[PDB]
Amino acid sequence: ERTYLYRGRILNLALEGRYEIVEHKPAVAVIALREGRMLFVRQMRPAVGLAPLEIPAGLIEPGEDPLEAARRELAEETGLSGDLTYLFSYFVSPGFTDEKTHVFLAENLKEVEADEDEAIEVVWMRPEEALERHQRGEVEFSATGLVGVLYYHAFLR
């Protein structure tokens, strides 16, 4: 039996007995490799006060399914389209939120727009270099960035 303390724009806060639960829209993320570089993005994230290394990601909007949201996010954040394949999903932090992320691979990328959402920085970077910069403390990862780097090292070399 959830009791709602806050109903917001991209989350709700509820109590369920002693549990504090954040309801959140599902998300998508896209792993894309070109010429040995992975497609990362960075943007200021007020929750953390910095810009972590992420892969293109977004929330699924009403009416959309994960594949469609992934296509849209990739185009809006980086100006690209590609051939998308579903990989796997994960709960970001199931001890307190129901946010679920669906991860896709993109191949054969083409520019469909001149990126285009300006507050997001497109960062093509070899995943080996992203991992080294992180190990040396020079950049933070989001879960989606780390998943992209680890998936590359597992399956795309």
116 is catalytic: yes
- Considering the candidates 61, 107, 116, 132, report the single residue annotated as catalytic: 116
**Residue ranges in 22-61 that form contacts with a copy of itself under rule CB under 8 A:** 22, 24, 27, 45-49, 52, 54, 57
In sequence order, the 6+-apart residues with CB closer than 8 A to the CB of 38 are 31, 32, 55, 124, 125, 126, 127, 130, 148, 149, 152
d(CA 19, CA 71): 35
Site for ligand AR6 contains 19 (CB under 6 A): yes
Site for ligand AR6 contains 116 (CB under 6 A): no
Residue selected from 58, 66, 82, 127 as contacting Mn ion according to rule CB under 5 A = 58
d(CA 84, CA 72): 11
CB 27 within 8 A of CB 100: yes
From the list a copy of itself, Mn ion, ligand AR6, none, partner contacted by residue 17 (C-beta under 5 to 8 A by kind): a copy of itself
CB of 131 to Mn ion, least distance (A): 22
